[PDB]
Assembly symmetry: C4
Homo-oligomer: 242 residues x 4
């Protein structure tokens, strides 16, 4: 039994195997770039379509193998779960009146992140910030929800494209947060009917802007506070212990 | 006497009471989201209106109770003052030719910030920066006031929508500070009549931008200077005292 | 002789004198805000005009006095030089076919910065950064000059409003640096004639953006490097000297 | 032999030589600014054209000399390589149906950066950050490539100006990253046909924005972590060694 199992485990945990997979990702990447062109597709079109159907069958083996080799531990791995879903997507057939999935196929190129350790590290690094930010995101989202409800009620009847709905207002308030056209595009028009509308949007811009800056400052200053704690230990320990 | 008073104080300072209040906030939140839809309002409309009239009577008890339990100390509490005003708003009746207040009702969902300690902390944290910034805000506001007066006098007669008034110019100068359409929307048009107008707006953009960046840098560098002072004490004390 | 001189020096260096001056600044401030309105000017117009002619004569005494009291040292003072020029401006009479100066009158409200120590400190603080930035500004300005010359030569004949002139191109390149309408407003139009124009503007946006961010980072990291040097001294001196 | 070689090496490594070169750069700079004007070119036009043909012959000597003096070491020098190419450009004759190069002539003013040590230092300083950023740029570029392919496939048939091509989509996605017109100009139009398009662009804006901020924070916090390591050594060494 454990004779057969290790036969595959030595294959899977192989460096070659990894490298081979990575080789395909890059190739199926270059492939999917060229499929973008209907010129290319009119000549070398069909070659590409089978290469796609190959790579995807190969990748399905890969995952089955990875699962057999890792069993439970695989579904406990964020990176493997990703690889499952991003290949699973590529399995569900175009046929069934949902041409959208034919467009998501290309998420399988994210496997290159999943398969290359220095990419993995970066992603892990970026993500590591988020869980501290969760409450602040929640507060900001509540803030949006309140203001979105208020604007729907104040401006939605005269300005329904922008505020007719909680979603329209959620969308407009995000545009205002990015400051895209907020004045020329949105508020200057609102004021033609609601002259005091600036009393809603300037303070919204102040709060939302102030928060994002403070978040950044908090992150930097709080992180530098830890590095200073860590110094105190090692500087004070070599003063005490010596 | 102090028999009856403590009967309520044990209720109010109850965890259950807090949790119950919080439960309503979330529900009256979800409620006010659905009121946004006239579809929903045409079916389940009236259920919602009474739930609103209940929650608001309940919340008025809550505050009366909170006041009896806390007396003076309550009106010395920013968080309670908020809760008073944000519920008071919700009391003043729609009737009296001011439909605006019907739209402010929803500020009562900010109680969720007021009622949940980790939200409270964040808000306290964000606000803690402001009092150091006060003079700089004052300087910036003076700067706006001077430039707003100057632009009203230079451009207001040909460009009254944007500069006819001190307020129009205050509003335009804030749009320029955010850089929304400043060139295409405002300055490029001004130059068609006042070719040297760029001499007003580029330097305004330099000053205002430079200041906001410097403020951020000052905050970070000045905060890291304190954390280094605090280290000196503990590092130097364990060198001296030992 | 030095009997008479000190008679005035005790007046000038008076706290009252300072406070009186500051009192006028605020009042002549509020005044110049109300002059903004032709409604107000049609009623209380003339009161205002004489108050202006008073304040300005008073301020001219002030400066003469300040000069007599300080002699050479006055013209060596940036803050006094400012006060000289910002009041001098207000002296040159509207008459002489230059209505622009009537609009600069209001720069005299900057005296409030000049006259209030906590404002003075802020301004001094903001300015303290600039001299380190001088070379980098020079580099950036050279960069603009080169790119402005290149764009005038590439795009100015088809796009003269935006690039016909070194100044037009200098102005457009600053708009691109702020990212105002850079694509929709400028580059997307250029591409209709010069399809590879993106090869000029994306890299311009990368360089200019990268530099401004790096400048900020350099300032923060370099400033935190000094505060760490200063610690080393005091931490190492109390280790050696004790 | 080494008699003749040193005759030139003393010339080239001369301070005067450097200063002379720098003098021309500034002059040929001022020159190329004035060539921008067809007024000036109609009067003093030809003077300028020969001055240009002189400066460029002189600069070609300079480089030949620099090469003879430095041999191999020259082509190992980024700054000299630059000087070679930026002067080489200026050699290839306008004639050959490529009027574009007549516009690149002016890159030779970048020699002033190359020739002035404090400029050199800045450029070296800015560049010093990039190699750490390489992987993150690669990740971001992969991200753009995936999203550009997806948008070409989702929106390119109805919105070909913006998404018809991988390049059009690459270009649009960069405009969205800068947030120029992203909503009013791009997404609001897309939604008229593809109402859920916001599900593509908001998350694209979140990822891309989050990353750029994190990069800046990482740089600052990671750099301050090194300066704290360096302190530990010198603070702990003067505790141990003394
Ligand atoms: C998201 O799920 C949360 C996880 C957190 O797991 P994490 O603890 O980061 O990973 C395991 C431990 N580590 C970092 C040392 C390898 O996140 C991860 O670390 C796993 C990431 C899962 C998604 C795969 C990434 C898709 C590519 C998207 C990158 C585009 C950004 C430009
Ligand atoms: C410090 C960190 C800063 C981040 C804090 C900001 C939080 C707010 C996020 C704003 C993004 C919302 C975008 C948005 O409004 O999308 C629309 C959706 C769906 O409603 P709706 O728009 O009617 O559906 C599509 C129809 N159309 C054409 C009118 C748009 O609108 C909705 O109804 C729901 C929106 C999603 C919920 C928000 C959760 C985001 C967590 C991140
Ligand atoms: C800290 C947590 C904060 C979380 C906040 C995130 C919530 C985001 C919800 C986004 C709303 C999604 C729906 C949307 O945008 O569309 C508006 C709809 C449509 O109105 P309706 O007129 O029904 O349109 C249907 C089409 N018709 C008329 C032709 C049949 O109108 C509606 O159906 C309104 C939907 C309201 C549902 C509210 C759910 C969120 C509960 C969060 C509670 C916060 C606690 C205080
Ligand atoms: C480092 C921190 C950065 C912050 C410093 C920036 C300070 C300047 C704040 C700019 C915001 C002003 C917004 C603004 O101008 O609003 C208009 C008001 C009212 O005048 P007005 O606009 O005529 O009334 C409405 C009529 N309409 C349609 C023509 C707008 O304009 C006014 O007349 C008064 C404006 C309020 C006073 C400013 C106090 C803000 C403190 C924060
Ligand atoms: C460090 C502190 C700095 C603080 C600065 C903040 C001041 C912000 C004031 C905002 C101005 C609010 C009024 C506004 O924007 O509207 C412009 C008005 C209206 O002109 P008007 O033609 O009267 O319009 C009335 C309508 N009508 C003609 C049909 C009867 O025209 C006016 O009435 C002008 C109002 C001028 C009042 C000035 C009050 C601020 C005093 C601050 C003193 C600073 C010390 C140097
Ligand atoms: C500009 O000229 C350079 C000077 C540098 O002199 P500085 O060494 O800063 O002043 C003397 C010493 N201090 C700081 C301890 C008082 O800069 C100054 O310190 C003097 C400032 C002269 C101009 C007066 C300020 C006008 C108000 C502009 C503020 C608007 C920004 C929002
Ligand atoms: C890290 C720090 C970032 C700062 C670095 C950026 C340096 C570049 C500054 C850009 C600002 C230039 C603004 C600009 O171009 O203004 C126009 C002037 C005058 O030429 P011109 O525009 O023909 O005169 C007015 C006619 N009109 C309607 C076509 C504009 O254009 C000119 O001809 C000369 C422009 C002034 C020289 C630049 C010195 C600025 C030092 C700060
Ligand atoms: C590190 C230092 C960098 C400093 C760079 C800052 C220089 C900024 C200069 C701004 C240019 C100001 C003039 C401007 O923008 O207008 C363009 C003019 C007008 O052309 P034109 O056709 O003569 O128009 C006159 C009107 N007309 C035809 C009806 C008689 O066309 C011209 O006259 C062009 C003016 C060129 C003068 C150049 C002066 C700057 C020398 C900096 C040297 C850098 C060293 C490499
Ligand atoms: C944290 C750091 C942030 C930086 C990360 C961002 C990376 C993405 C860079 C985006 C810039 C791309 C600009 C772009 O799309 O230019 C167009 C080219 C050429 O295709 P195409 O546009 O068809 O050729 C010109 C035709 N026209 C009029 C439709 C534009 O588009 C292409 O086909 C190729 C684009 C160049 C490859 C990207 C490599 C950039 C490395 C930096
Ligand atoms: C971490 C590394 C990431 C690096 C990503 C950077 C790649 C950027 C490539 C930019 C694409 C340049 C071409 C472009 O934008 O134009 C689109 C073309 C033109 O379509 P087409 O219809 O042939 O137009 C020709 C004109 N016609 C029809 C009249 C004869 O359509 C095409 O030809 C599409 C070109 C696809 C080539 C893909 C090359 C990049 C391979 C990167 C592999 C990533 C590994 C996962
Ligand atoms: C302070 C703000 C939120 C406001 C708040 O809650 N203020 C009350 C205290 C929150 C939001 C994101 C949080 C950081 C990130 O998680 C990254 C990192 C993780 C470590 O684990 C601890 C250090 C650090 C720097 C975190 C510190 C702090 O937690 C931050 C700045
Ligand atoms: C320096 C600038 C204003 C310019 C100025 O006044 N410069 C003259 C000195 C002001 C504006 C906001 C101020 C900070 C915040 O308050 C937060 C925090 C509170 C602590 O209590 C002390 C530390 C810290 C970091 C403050 C330091 C400093 O005070 C700041 C940066
Ligand atoms: C590093 C960059 C320019 C690039 C460069 O020149 N890099 C070669 C080294 C320049 C531009 C502005 C300069 C700062 C400001 O002056 C403020 C302050 C003044 C003190 O006096 C010394 C510290 C500090 C933080 C300065 C450090 C450094 O000088 C900076 C960051
Ligand atoms: C952390 C991020 C990338 C994300 C990542 O890879 N996270 C896994 C660990 C990368 C991108 C750019 C990198 C910096 C620059 O190079 C400048 C400088 C060079 C020194 O040599 C080492 C210090 C420093 C501050 C570098 C630290 C770190 O390397 C950075 C922040």
């Amino acid at each position: 039994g454990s004779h057969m199992y290790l036969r595959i485990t030595n294959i899977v945990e192989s460096s070659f195997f990894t490298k081979f997979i990575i080789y395909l990702i890059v190739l199926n990447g270059i492939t999917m770039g060229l499929e973008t062109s209907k010129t290319f597709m009119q000549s070398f079109g069909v070659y590409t379509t089978l290469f796609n159907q190959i790579v995807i069958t190969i990748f399905t083996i890969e995952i089955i193998l990875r699962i057999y080799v890792h069993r439970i531990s695989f579904f406990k791995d964020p990176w493997s779960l990703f690889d499952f879903f991003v290949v699973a997507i590529s399995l569900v057939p175009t046929s069934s009146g949902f041409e959208i999935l034919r467009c998501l196929r290309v998420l399988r190129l994210f496997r290159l992140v999943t398969a290359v350790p220095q990419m993995r590290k970066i992603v892990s690094a970026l993500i590591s910030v988020i869980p501290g930010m969760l409450s602040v995101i929640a507060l900001m989202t509540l803030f949006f929800y309140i203001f979105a409800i208020m604007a729907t009620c104040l401006f939605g009847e005269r300005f329904p494209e922008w505020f007719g709905t909680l979603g329209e207002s959620f969308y407009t308030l995000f545009q205002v947060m990015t400051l895209e056209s907020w004045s020329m595009g949105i508020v200057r028009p609102l004021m033609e009917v609601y002259p005091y509308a600036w009393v809603f949007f300037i303070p919204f811009i102040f709060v939302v802007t102030f928060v994002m800056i403070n978040l950044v400052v908090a992150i930097i200053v709080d992180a530098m506070a830890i590095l200073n704690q860590k110094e105190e230990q090692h500087i004070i320990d070599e003063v005490q212990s010596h």
